[PDB]
Design an enzyme around this catalytic site. Structure first.
Site, PDB file in Angstrom:
ATOM      1  N   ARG B  61       0.804  -1.211   0.000  1.00  0.00           N
ATOM      2  CA  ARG B  61       0.000   0.000   0.000  1.00  0.00           C
ATOM      3  C   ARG B  61       0.836   1.259   0.000  1.00  0.00           C
ATOM      4  O   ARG B  61       1.676   1.444   0.882  1.00  0.00           O
ATOM      5  CB  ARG B  61      -0.919   0.008   1.222  1.00  0.00           C
ATOM      6  CG  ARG B  61      -1.624   1.330   1.475  1.00  0.00           C
ATOM      7  CD  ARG B  61      -2.804   1.146   2.411  1.00  0.00           C
ATOM      8  NE  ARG B  61      -3.431   2.410   2.797  1.00  0.00           N
ATOM      9  CZ  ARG B  61      -3.108   3.103   3.884  1.00  0.00           C
ATOM     10  NH1 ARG B  61      -2.162   2.654   4.698  1.00  0.00           N
ATOM     11  NH2 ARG B  61      -3.736   4.243   4.160  1.00  0.00           N
ATOM     12  N   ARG B 108      -5.767  18.770   7.501  1.00  0.00           N
ATOM     13  CA  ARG B 108      -4.553  18.615   8.290  1.00  0.00           C
ATOM     14  C   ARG B 108      -4.066  19.953   8.840  1.00  0.00           C
ATOM     15  O   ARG B 108      -4.363  21.011   8.284  1.00  0.00           O
ATOM     16  CB  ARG B 108      -3.449  17.960   7.450  1.00  0.00           C
ATOM     17  CG  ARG B 108      -3.698  16.491   7.140  1.00  0.00           C
ATOM     18  CD  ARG B 108      -2.387  15.756   6.894  1.00  0.00           C
ATOM     19  NE  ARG B 108      -2.254  14.543   7.710  1.00  0.00           N
ATOM     20  CZ  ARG B 108      -2.606  13.319   7.318  1.00  0.00           C
ATOM     21  NH1 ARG B 108      -3.118  13.119   6.117  1.00  0.00           N
ATOM     22  NH2 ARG B 108      -2.439  12.287   8.130  1.00  0.00           N
ATOM     23  N   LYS B 258     -13.278   3.520   0.298  1.00  0.00           N
ATOM     24  CA  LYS B 258     -12.985   3.513   1.725  1.00  0.00           C
ATOM     25  C   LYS B 258     -14.123   4.162   2.485  1.00  0.00           C
ATOM     26  O   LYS B 258     -14.506   5.294   2.196  1.00  0.00           O
ATOM     27  CB  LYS B 258     -11.681   4.270   2.001  1.00  0.00           C
ATOM     28  CG  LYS B 258     -10.441   3.589   1.444  1.00  0.00           C
ATOM     29  CD  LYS B 258      -9.215   4.484   1.513  1.00  0.00           C
ATOM     30  CE  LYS B 258      -8.908   4.914   2.939  1.00  0.00           C
ATOM     31  NZ  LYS B 258      -7.721   5.804   2.968  1.00  0.00           N
ATOM     32  N   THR B 316      -6.504  -0.576   9.778  1.00  0.00           N
ATOM     33  CA  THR B 316      -6.132   0.338  10.856  1.00  0.00           C
ATOM     34  C   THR B 316      -6.039  -0.131  12.304  1.00  0.00           C
ATOM     35  O   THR B 316      -7.006  -0.608  12.885  1.00  0.00           O
ATOM     36  CB  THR B 316      -7.029   1.575  10.825  1.00  0.00           C
ATOM     37  OG1 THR B 316      -6.791   2.297   9.609  1.00  0.00           O
ATOM     38  CG2 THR B 316      -6.749   2.459  12.018  1.00  0.00           C
TER      39      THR B 316
HETATM   40  K   LIG Z   1      -4.715   8.405   2.670  1.00  0.00           K
HETATM   41 MN   LIG Z   2      -8.166   7.762   6.126  1.00  0.00          MN
END
Ligand SMILES: [K+]
Ligand SMILES: [Mn+2]
Ligand SMILES: [K+]
Ligand SMILES: [K+]
Ligand SMILES: [Mn+2]
Ligand SMILES: [Mn+2]
Lengths: 519, 519, 519
Positions: B61, B108, B258, B316
């Site tokens: 990944r 962010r 996702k 995760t």
């Molecule tokens: K990402």
């Molecule tokens: Mn994410």
């Protein structure tokens, strides 16, 4: 979007049930899974404890693996002070059990040099000499390591592995000795002081009940603990030796055998019958047998306990990271959910509440997840399989229990009110996993306290004196329950509720069931 | 003690199945769950990568949330170098997919002061001023904090909560502003540099596919990635916008949506159909919705994907602690086991292998647990429910698949050999969860590579030129599979095996099935 | 060897359940399937009737297809005399319902020559002229045949088939006419006098409720019959026309729609809702549709009735051969068993008891088989499926019913005592098929009487005047039941029993359930 994951409850198959889980389906207020919190520095405080109770604490675990009787004596004193601080309103008073966790036949290292960071540094590949000489008892170097197990050399030949500190550090015995062993560090790390030692695959000849254990047990009886979590039970015999020490006085203290070694798993069944409940001690278990197999044992033990109707506890590192952070990791979140889904009666915190920086947050998190997970259960299949499992029995209380849970599912009762003194009636109702909360009203305090061991039972202690007329005394108790529920937000006036009572004072079981509306 | 948890396989009920799990029942060698490893500093090395492959890595990944095209370009180069280093022996060569993880519409913060520990310290209760002025872009104090989301003020009113750094730190907007917001620190902590920001319950108006995302996507097509993990897909539309950028050239790149926000969960179904597979992005998901509910979404998404026959990934913090320790926590161990038990096609490591101190150990651990968990599945019920789920379909390949898996359970085949070029035939066999490994032999490399996305498929690339006689070309391929299996320790001469092939070169599906002995 | 086929009850699967049936496993004394006996010459006698009651008769069927009001008036008088002859002891008195079977829109031939054996002889291939001229009404030859259906020519074209005498004789219309039809004998035989005629696949335009039917219905109301078996109901409309005639006075007479034609089967559902119960009139049904399909309709109708909670009856030729022999044929034996196994609430005898040589033996045989078959039911699966079937409902009485049956299975109760006045409570308990007998104690006689329509309900009429204290009146009723049971051999002192009662006089349903021991 319905609630309590009811749309999924209607599922025919599991895949279906699974597919229908809805994150937008609100769970009910009652949280059926008992929460056991290990008390320590971070939670010793009466004020902290009061906050713990309000956050969901149901059982306070005293871990005798450390501390002195003087210590625990005060810990217990505080939890009791904290508890009784609510003793005011019988409607808001929540019983809190006291559990003593045995420091069983366990192996530990001594103290480290001191000025060496109270933590030496074994390097991957280095040589480490294990010693039994009580001189280095408090002076352990990167070359010298003392452990309390004297006969260690009588059961570990060259080549065997000896783990230290939650199996994080491994050592391979390179050479034998009379009272010493020279080994090679396999897994490097910073050894701490007085850390646990594991000899997987090794006939460790320490006694089920050690000398200290007998003292600790006697202490617990005199301090009226409600249950004993017996460490390293490896066979029915051990449980009996334990029950014996508790003796005639400790007669009613429930014994919870802890499965932490390979033998205990292998001899689970006899241990189960000999015991009152079981604890899946994931900690040592994960070191005594391959970590990747611990889940197998958990599900097997929870499964078999559920089937047997005996309380089972899932313990150790569930919300581990929260010892330092305010939020748990995704794995820890799912770990808790699955334990509840597995069928565990109680989940435990130890470290997360004993010495971590977020005792309250950790308790709240378990409480949140449990509720969420409980609604997610596949109640119908569960009840059906639970029923098939025990079809050979024709017990009258069991019949009452099953009939009631059944009825409760059908009309979606807000709760089941069970008047019990020994608790048997309520236990039995809990055995068949109703979805709603089980409000057990008892005049016996120790019953109320031990009740937490069972999934779904929310104990209530009636403090009013027995009424002259049985009929009246019953309504009295039932009404108390009706209030607790209304107050606790379990249900409001109008909701339907199932009520189980006896036929005459001191009945054998609650033989009477009736659907009633909340006043 | 049988193996592969077969005694439990014979169970009638779940409780039974559960009760029969045996820690002493050895699992088989083949590990059906795909393992996706996020590459980074700790794993960039070609030598490390080779070790990763040998340890179980199936998909590398590339997380475009960080790094430059130049960076990833080399990462991809190395994994390919590492992979092809085994390209020698077609029997031992293991295909390794390359996946590009989009840095979707994410928020962010900027860089911290620098000499302030590159980490400030927000105190529980302190005041923090959020700023959009690009000046403090790289000078964030305990009072000044910059974030890249310009319209943040156009969607967050006073009172709303803004989380920072994996939701570990929370802030409450005390006062609004034009291009700034003054908030109160709720959860204290040490803010890092350029950390993720979450605005749960807030119409974040960032684009599904950002400008950078279009560049990154184009880059992936030119670099021939096998799949795209599209971050923050909140509706079928987003998936389409993504598929569009990939365009005609990226036509065969599988898109994995996702699910990380509440909308994505709420609009899952349309997203599922629009996508090739799904990823349960537990990370952001655990911040956008209550942590205690993430398990609900996981099981629901895995459940529905399994039902749909589309690949699903659990991701995760599965083995989080291993970023610093050689052994995972009990919760992390069970987390992995349950994801496999849940039905996840692939499990992921990110951080544990990207920058932790134990990439190899982490990969090995997942590999170990998966195997263990896979044997623990309740195959019979699973197959039955999976069958009921799709009864409306009468697809010929599906019939072949089901017939084969059925047959395989019955004679306990050592494996299923499937000759496929598009992969459809093998996918279909994987859909119905056989217990044994599925050896899919293909001449198409990208097929072999993408095959990892499916549970149980162990891809093998035939590198021999097409034989003149179809019959011969088939035996050729089948024999290759027979060798891979013998070599990989999946089965030895004598064992039984199911083989699915076409009827004529370039068939629509493997319409032929036969039980054959291993030569 | 256990009893009541309990070992098989424990089966997981059907094949298992089936495999475990034990001919040496003794059934209990209570026979739950109601037995309806058609009264006639062979059973008109009060003394015979008394013997019928003792042998198991529960409902006396008056077939108005023949006889005069004067006739039936006396038949009914006798059954009542016979019944009340036991009215002495309220503990041994068994209520017996009176049912009127409509002679609906049916076709019949006239009388035969007389000196021609009262039975002509149609030869296979011969020609037969059908006539509507009332002159030959009582002079039917092998060439002349009269039938009461005047519009027969308005709905049967050349080629169509006309069956006579339980379809044993078939005829093919060779040529049409104004008021006559010449046909060819296909199935030879000896035509009897005034035999039934069937026009399968033909829009027979006779009225649902004929003129005679209105008279017969009014007659039944004045004679206080408990139920009406309405012949040839082909749609909900017909049922309503019937309910209308019964009117305000016949308001409580339960209407049982008889399914005997293809339309009735095709429009079953609306007919079911419009009706109180259903009867599978296998006789005409086996002529209106292919004989080999009748079983399909039976199982479908019983299945759907069971699901709907409405009484269903299996009727016609079950023990046919016993009209002349003391023992039934193997097929007849299994026919009865399967009807019970199918779920039929009541089985019927008509002919076997109306004019055969062994009325008593026939009744006894049904009683024997039913018991035997009842124990053979797969109660667990049955209850489970019955539950799934009605999951959409959340009715409180239903919940009570289900909870009780559940409880009863679990502790293997000896019986369920239900105090009901309308009968609803008991019906509901019967809906969920308990294994034990349901003793319904009522003060309402018509309730007690109609109760037989339900599987497992054993009615008991309390004849004591209402007691002043509700609590007392309840014990009174419960004790009566306790005695009936002890007397009838259903259970002895000590056995466990479930008891369902109301909460206040005139409750809506029995909301109270309790496990009690037999005094
Ligand atoms: K990402
Ligand atoms: Mn994410
Ligand atoms: K301990
Ligand atoms: K009739
Ligand atoms: Mn321990
Ligand atoms: Mn008829």
């Amino acid at each position: 979007i319905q609630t309590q994951q009811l749309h999924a409850a209607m599922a025919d198959t599991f895949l279906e049930h699974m597919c229908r889980l809805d994150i937008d389906s609100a769970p009910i207020t009652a949280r059926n899974t008992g929460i056991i919190c290990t008390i320590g520095p971070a939670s010793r405080s009466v004020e902290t404890l009061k906050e713990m109770i309000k956050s969901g604490m149901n059982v306070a675990r005293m871990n005798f693996s450390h501390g002195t009787h003087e210590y625990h004596a005060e810990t217990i004193k505080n939890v009791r002070t904290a508890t009784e601080s609510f003793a005011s309103d019988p409607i808001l008073y929540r019983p809190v059990a006291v559990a003593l966790d045995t420091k069983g036949p366990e192996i530990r290292t001594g103290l480290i040099k001191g000025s060496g960071t109270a933590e030496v540094e074994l390097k991957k590949g280095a040589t480490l000499k294990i010693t039994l000489d009580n001189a280095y008892m408090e002076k352990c170097d990167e070359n010298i390591l003392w452990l309390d197990y004297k006969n260690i050399c009588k059961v570990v030949d060259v080549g065997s592995k000896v783990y230290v500190d939650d199996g994080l550090i491994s050592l391979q015995v390179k050479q034998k000795g009379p009272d010493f062993l020279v080994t090679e560090v396999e897994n490097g790390g910073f050894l701490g002081s007085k850390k646990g030692v594991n000899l997987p695959g090794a006939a460790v000849d320490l006694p089920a009940v050690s000398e200290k254990d007998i003292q600790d047990l006697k202490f617990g009886v005199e301090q009226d603990v409600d249950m004993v979590f017996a460490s390293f039970i490896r066979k029915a015999a051990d449980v009996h030796e334990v029950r014996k020490i508790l003796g005639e006085k400790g007669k009613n203290i429930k014994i919870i055998s802890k499965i932490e070694n390979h033998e205990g798993v292998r001899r689970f069944d006899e241990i189960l019958e000999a015991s009152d409940g079981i604890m899946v001690a994931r900690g040592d278990l994960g070191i005594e047998i391959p970590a990747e197999k611990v889940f197998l044992a958990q599900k097997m033990i929870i499964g078999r306990c559920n089937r047997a109707g005996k309380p089972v506890i899932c313990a150790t590192q569930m919300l581990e990271s929260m010892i330092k952070k305010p939020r748990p990791t995704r794995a820890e979140g799912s770990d808790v959910a699955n334990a509840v889904l597995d069928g565990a009666d109680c989940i435990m915190l130890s470290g997360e509440t004993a010495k971590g920086d977020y005792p309250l947050e950790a308790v709240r998190m378990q409480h949140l997840i449990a509720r969420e997970a409980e609604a997610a259960m596949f109640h119908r299949k569960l009840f059906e399989e639970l029923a098939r499992a025990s079809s050979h029995s024709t017990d009258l209380m069991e019949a009452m229990a099953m009939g009631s849970v059944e009825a409760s599912y059908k009309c979606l009762a807000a709760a089941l009110i069970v008047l019990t003194e020994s608790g048997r009636s309520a236990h039995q109702v809990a055995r068949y996993r109703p979805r709603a909360p089980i409000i057990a009203v008892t005049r016996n305090h120790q019953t109320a306290r031990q009740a937490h061991l069972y999934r779904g039972i929310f104990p209530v202690v009636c403090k009013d004196p027995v009424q002259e007329a049985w009929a009246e005394d019953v309504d009295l108790r039932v009404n108390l329950a009706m209030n607790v529920g209304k107050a606790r937000g379990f249900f409001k006036k109008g909701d339907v509720v199932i009520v189980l009572t006896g036929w005459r004072p001191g009945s054998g079981f609650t033989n009477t069931m009736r659907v009633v509306p909340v006043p």
